[model samples]
Target chain A: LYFQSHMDEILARAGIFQGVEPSAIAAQPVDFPRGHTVFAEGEPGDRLYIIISGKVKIGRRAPDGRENLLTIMGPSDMFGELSIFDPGPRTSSATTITEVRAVSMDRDALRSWIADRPEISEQLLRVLARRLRRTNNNLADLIFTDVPGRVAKQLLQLAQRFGTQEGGALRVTHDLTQEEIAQLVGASRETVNKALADFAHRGWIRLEGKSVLISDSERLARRA
Target chain B: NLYFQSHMDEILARAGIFQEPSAIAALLQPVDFPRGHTVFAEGEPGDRLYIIISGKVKIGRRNLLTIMGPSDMFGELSIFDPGPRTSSATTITEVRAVSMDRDALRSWIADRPEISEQLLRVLARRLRRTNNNLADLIFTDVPGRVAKQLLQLAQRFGTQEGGALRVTHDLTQEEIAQLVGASRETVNKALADFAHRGWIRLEGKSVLISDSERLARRA
Candidate 1:
């Protein structure tokens, strides 16, 4: 159905920093190695980041210390933006999945930019709206979709975000461990691993270490 | 905390967007809906934003996301984006609202750009709330979720009466199940357990809380 494609198109239209010169905002370049925690939940934050390269995972920790993966961001994506508006602690934690390069703007600098260019306010609103829609979709999926269906859907989404076409198949270099995938789909590790093995046996996908090659997305889409 | 529910109007007023109510009144047209009415549905094109003056509305798709009351607003995203409605909104009680069409809201923002900034704050608050809901669903069990839901409803709708906090949620057990993303029977069992413990009393559609501290602890 290309549902994710339609959402990606909407987000592209409302991409951050649209119609504004990069030179106008005061931003600093930052870098982090893989497996580094950029920020943690409940810590005070004053900056928002814009990814220039590599991937980062946004996650939340439960009261009992269990982690729930929220979303993965690649190049051109923005994170930690809610701090600029609310002056509160970080709502979620961000950790690098690969060596990452990014730019960050402090709250004051971003506020000044928005105050000077009011049109930027609409763009920011659209960005937040898109995020809310995604979160709501996840909430609905938790209620209506079972574990195997959720595993298939999460794989399709990751492929859409990070995959490259290789001949007849799409290869996703997501670098996510099976445990991480279980967290993303809100299921047990054993259950998620079983689902993956079942898909492999059915000739829907080929698993190579952390990467997944989807040879039958049409069938996967139906499963999702 | 429910930032948008508690502070959105204050933010707008501080920005001078609501300094004069008559100006906003001129741009808005009064409307009313009967109980159990669908104000808007998912995937439908929407062109107007609504501000509630009285009664409650349930916003959701397949599962109930939230129930909003007086002073809360809905359908505001359509004012800035051309996308179809993301969820459905239906009235839980007979509702009185004032609506502003897209063009009217656009001109209003053009006149006072600060309104856009306030609206951004509103959307940001909603995003935080939705994110919290997503996390709770993944991390918290059904009874814990029901406890949290009851506490939030008490905070928003409770009235003090003779040593008890009475919350008139005006929701069926099935609707409450939807809010907590659980089956009706499961939520009913949870409610029965709470009542058996003497922590709460369920009176048909209303709930009377005797020990909010215990509920808070459970959540």
Candidate 2:
């Protein structure tokens, strides 16, 4: 029930699916323990997953056999939707960041449900368009921005999504490690570490255990 | 108005929308564009989407990315995005098109559920393509990307000629550089090496793939 509500909320936030019936979304619950590989790259993909609880890490293995982290998806996020109509080999691997529970739907079933509800399809289109825009921006960022600028941009994005106000500073509550940040920013871990230290010294952000607190937004985004 | 004969009908079929041509014809308004005309400029407010009935257009940011010819779609980003254009499109040839604005498009999709699924597939495919481009930029070298792109073009637009495949696009080495995100000199060397290796045969500006499997294996 909570999963359906959250899914509806995400769709609503995207300004679509105004009249979609929540019960029409057919899903089956599946669970995974911490650090378990849910699926791997090059595997056949026929189902799309929605995070009901816990977090998942999406990554791809480089040709050198190094695992490059892509993004961390938490509760309410969806993955593997790309292969629904155009089913093919999975592009990346997904692993449980924590003990995970998610709702999975067969692509065929999803297709019929979408056909029954035009609002759902409309909402999906908006969601895809938004993600595509973000990915395009990410490509441009990689092409033009320096490492520091990229990290700053990433932190700002993270803070926007996961941060809460703590007096004048914004406290980001995601379990983002230095290595993960390095991965998302497409830079070395050492480079990210050095940049974070410099930002802390400059009073732009303060590191608090796993998360970060941003004190400056304007100066940081100016790096772009 | 018959289906499955013209190039436009083939593209519609390829997009996986198994609708009668009359349905799409009713939804789309015929529009003509002259050579050197701006179809849509980047960051301009837009809601109309277009399908190329015929002719070619150049898509880009600061430089040309690729050319879209007959039956290819453009301005599709507007179908879902109510905001400004992401990339500018300019006609390279005298063009004929069919276009639909936001409201018309929504109704069109609503009437034909298959079109909605096709729209999703279109977005997903392009997203995957853009992501692959980024991955190539980060992971692969310039020569590798050039090879991969050539192979992709050949697959999409090549004609089988006895033992080889011929891709007859009039793309300059400079435009090739823009597509692969490399210098012209780099692409020139890469093309020359491929030709020398018997993997491809250069004919003027076109490419004939003599050993496509070999090129594919190398990539």
Candidate 3:
């Protein structure tokens, strides 16, 4: 895979791991199959992961057993670090959306690394700050935005993150099922489907199988 | 401001920064503000961190996110990063706080590398709380969220009275609605329902919780 060839480059560019040799730390390279649960909620974990390739969904399970998707991680994104700092049970579950390649760093090793270079702690702080801001924005959107607007917003965000230009349209291969998209937008599947149909009818997007082709991202952004 | 020394020491201790009070105390400047003051607003450039010594502060954007009381820290993200503030902070009551700027905190951290780890832990706790709030917005119903919010207010601002917990939330129905991401009318209905059931009694901006167990179950 391209990830294997660019592994060193990926490690070098990772903000948290900057100036640190990949082999110098006790970090392990990991691979997971699609639909695999990398970590589960309430489980004890000592390692945090940095994705090199593929997609991962961080989610929490409600008391009623419904899964609420929090955020998705792509290449260079980190997850599971909260437990490393707090030493508590995992607050959320990270599951792979595609076959994933990542680097995992242990708590003690990471602590030593941060101690060796305090700037790493600052980088980690920035990451947490950004995540907090995104979570707050999602909360506000859930409170204020309508279902169709939310769907459009989610789609535009996905297109920004995972889209590829094909012909004149942007094709988004987000690797999420319709139900998963519904969960991410905090709406029912039927409602999300209706919104998608309406968007498609309006020539803003075209749904092809699980992926989507955005023909009019400007209109989608305005709707969002 | 004079009374904040001991509270500041306790806060630093809780944050795992074990430096002597006199050493780190010089980094903070005491600042006071009256009620209904906008401490900071979203999109404003800020590089200061605040630690509350007294009174409550509300943190949010368009809707209320959280309310903080004594010993709680706010505007900390700006200390590490000088970007514009992500959320606004306003004083709910007359507040007294100790503030440190980014440059001072950075120099302090440069001398003590361990302090960075402690700050990271603080941010980690904040991110965890924000994520939980996001999940609650998705999974919890409006009334259930109101119950949860009441329980949190009781934990943070409650005072022990005779048979009930008197929570001096100092938040109006509209503010409470903003806290729980619901309409004021819906939140008022929930409060009335709880009041009718004798679970809670509303007194102006305060609530007297007679049966927190029932509220917890509802939450």
Candidate 4:
């Protein structure tokens, strides 16, 4: 019952379900242990999932068979919504980075649920539009910005989402390995290593164990 | 009676929107643009959505994009989330299109579940294509990028001639350069190289591919 209420709170805070009747949500609870896949690429996309707790990583394999980490999503985030409308094959695979409790809604139920509540549809549009704009911005960056600049920008982005401010620095709480960080920034592992070292050398960031702490974000933004 | 019922049907088929002819006829407004005319500029209020019935339009920053022709939809991002247009659209050739007001489009899609389904797929596919372009831009060389864009355009807008595939729309070297993210001079040099290799023919603004297999290998 406590988990259910927590899920309800997360949904209420999420943009796509704002103002929706908590009863009408029809959230079916599903759990996946840490480091397990929620769905795989090319699988039939029949349902969508909203995170109740923990983290999920959405990624896809490139033509060269390299696994590219697309993004990390946590509570109040949703995935597989593309199938809610299209009911087609999944474009990417999703895996739980931490033990996860998510609510899955059938595509058919979601469509009708959306049809009945016109405002929810508007919320859905805003969510998809935000993602589209993010992808567009990423493409522009790929074309115009160098690797180190992209790295700095990516760190700043992650910091914005998952950081806690300290006295004069922002400590990124998410535990990401250097390899994963490299993938997030669209740079090679060696290049990311060099870039991170350079940032640490310049007093922009301080590396304590695996944690990346941003000491000077304003200067880092200029670097990006 | 709508003037171009067949064109409407074609776009409907392409977008997977199964609509009654009469219903669509009532909702869609016919619009025209002469060659080289600006259809819509970036940051302008996106009040209407357009589906191209004929001719071509260049889309992007400074008009650096592949030309979109029949069955291609534009300004759809606004229909879902009302905002300023993301990219400028300019006619490459004289164009005839159908426009839908945002309110009418939203209500119509609400009434027609299949239209909603299809519209989402259309947007999803476009998102994938844009991501592919980003990957190619980051990963591939200029000649390879040019080759891939040509193949994509040929697949979409080419017709088979006697022994080659001829692109239907005329494209200037500058536009091709913009599409492939190369300088105009570099695009010209590459075209000349392809011509010397007997892979393609560039007559005035028209492009004809004599060998697709070789281009595929290059890509």
Candidate 5:
């Protein structure tokens, strides 16, 4: 049984399912830990996530063994919705970056959720539009930017989302390997290695083992 | 402001022009080509013709072929009955066009017979281009592909000044890849040869044509 009070609170805070009670959400238990492979690329998508807690990443694996992180999602951000809708193999693989606790809805249940709840339908459409706009921007970036410019753009994105100010430096939780970044830009890992090293050697970013810290955002951005 | 002027507004404005030039002011849409994109298979619906806005589009049938470039229009055989597409218009590169589907255009023709006729004339120029592409493909090899494509580029986009046509368009390695049915790397290697012979100059995504006449002769 759902706590009515807890359900009402979630309803109030969430524009999607504003009226949905705690019982309606169908809380699911997940045991995924950091770096666990949740789903492989090309695997069937059986569930969609509504992040209850922790962080997860979705990315594509390139032939060069690099995983391109397309998006690092947390609470209020969702993934696998596209694959569920497309009814196709997962475009990218999903991996747990941290201890992830999320609520999920299968295809039939998700359809029922939309059909029964107009507020949820609205919120779902809003998120869909947002993702589409991002996808279009990705296309535009591909049209003009070279590999270096693209990686720069990704760092800029990461910094905005995860940068933490520590001892006059900006650090992020991600200690991305070169191969991982290369997948996102459709470049080779060797290219990413050279590019990231170039950034580090130039003192643009602080290299702390696998962890990355961007020191001079302005310099790395090709600014004057 | 530059992006607004150069990219954003122009793309939107061109979108408007494609439907109604006086009212809309947009151009056409870009389409993908998986290496070779055929606009029409023989005896297929011929309602739509296309204006080649970018990349190389080939128009041909049964060993007859030609490549058309920017500002070149094609598939005009639609002027007759707008029936089955006469010759297939295929993309040598991914192509873009100012396209009006057949049914909407039927009413459009009533008020603009002159524009329709003008389009037919554009198709005629395209026909000549296609003949050249086919002739080069059948009778020649890599040098022919390189020579003919460049000569035509000069023919369409160049302005005759000082007894020489100067080609003033910026083409990327990808665009050149489409034109000659080769990989961008292959095209880049070939371009180095053209540069050595003083037929072209390339710095990044730009090509400055040096010899249209010699290119035509080489083809």
Candidate 6:
């Protein structure tokens, strides 16, 4: 949900420029020709990462030995911050996709930031409230509603915050993957693919590769 | 013993000092209030005479508590002072009322206006608080009990657009597990199955409702 590097410039006006000071953040040098593995599984994670350059993938390997990409990090992305909370083995592997440069925070520095900045507590509360509300809605899904309904609900939310009105159609910008859709709805990639196909077939949506165009907001809302 | 005749003699002795005892006793009849029974409430007409015959009685003012107890006879504050019943009496055991009637009580109150006003003001406040507790239960689910609050919220506060509420705000598979008192995996399976069935349309954070009437039928 966040890009780590550009926080000071973008979030400065948003009133959340915590950890933005150039003087406080420790700059570190790195050489990864095309962001490649700087660390592997079971490594001691004693540093916080602030990406100054390049892209990163923070993921875990599945039982079948495939990488499950939980999130993708680019320039300004923050990673390895969780080590400040638990300075144990790396639960997942970190690899760079492009040549990368980043600022690193040690365990002590991360702790000092938390102790000195009180606003982090309130920000943590907002994040947690959102998580609980999300979970509560998920319960509503299980006992009461259905799939196309879930899809409709999701599309409506997207339209509310990110959808751009083009004539009557809601133009969704994010190129969402079938796997991502499956993760949100707790369905298989195949199931979400079929659901998307069905919506496209009904002409309620236009699914071009990964782009989604909601044809009727009111109709989609009613469907959910 | 003769309850009505003795109270009638006492009333005549106090109120009508010149009246003969035989004249007042003629109008008296025994009134029996059984055990676990209610006498007149705290603010009803006090036109009656009662004397203990077999069982002792409890007359009590209801406090903000269940502290009203037995042997706490309360009517004496009004009866001897000749006004109204200071407290409502519920017999904890069998009790008898022997003496005049409502006409005599009304005549007694005509002399004392102070106690009648005090009893009326206090009883009104007690009954109002009891009604508030009933309303609060409908809204909040006290922990460890069944959490029917969400359903109640849906039913009562749900938006009705031609009688259908749109309850779509960011519900994930994990959230459904906690709210409906089930596992996230269970909820996820059920929702996935529903999505397969075509009963509803889902979006990112909102749920679009189609047939709440039909949905409620199952519950």
Best candidate according to lDDT: 3
User: Which model, 2 or 6, shows the larger DockQ?
Assistant: 2
Each candidate structure's TM-score, on Cα atoms with residue i matched to residue i, is 0.89, 0.89, 0.91, 0.86, 0.45, 0.38
lDDT of 6 by residue, A132-173 (tens): 234334434533566667767766665554467779788874
- Interface RMSD for model 6 amounts to 24.4
lDDT of 5 by residue, A92-208 (tens): 677887786666667788767655554454344445534433443454454446777777777777776667888877886564555666655556778767777888888988667
Among all windows of ten consecutive residues in candidate 3 chain B, which has the lowest summed lDDT?
B12-21
lDDT of 6 at A204: 89
- Scored against the true structure, residue A127 in model 1 reaches a CA lDDT of 73
- Candidate 2 vs 5: which has more TM-score: 2
Q: Candidate 2, residues B138-187: lDDT per residue as tens digits?
A: 77788888898888777666889985899866566887787788889998
Between prediction 1 and prediction 6, the one with superior lDDT is 1
lDDT of 6 at A101: 72
Give fnat (model 4). Answer: 0.35
Candidate 4 lDDT tens digits, A1-224: 98667767877777677657665455388889988888898898788888878788877776677666667787888888876565578777888878888888887777787677766766776677667767777777766778899988888887877788889899975566787777777789999899989999999998776567999999988998
Kindly report the root-mean-square deviation of model 2 from the true structure over all alpha carbons. 3.0
lDDT by residue (A94-197, candidate 1, tens digit) is 99989987778887777777778776777787778777887887878887899999999999989977899999999988888898899889899999999999
Ranking by TM-score: 3, 2, 1, 4, 5, 6
Q: What does DockQ come to for candidate 2?
A: 0.64
- Residue lDDT tens for model 5, B1-219: 243333323443332223222344322355555437887776687666566556666654432234566655555455433355555676766666656565555555554433433333333333223323433333456666776666666666566656454664345566655556545776666678888998776555345676766766766
In candidate 2, which residue pairs get closer than 3 Å at backbone N, Cα or C atoms, i.e. clash? none
TM-scores for chain B, listed for all candidates: 0.88, 0.86, 0.89, 0.90, 0.53, 0.30
Q: CAPRI verdict on model 5?
A: incorrect
lDDT of each: 0.82, 0.76, 0.85, 0.77, 0.58, 0.48
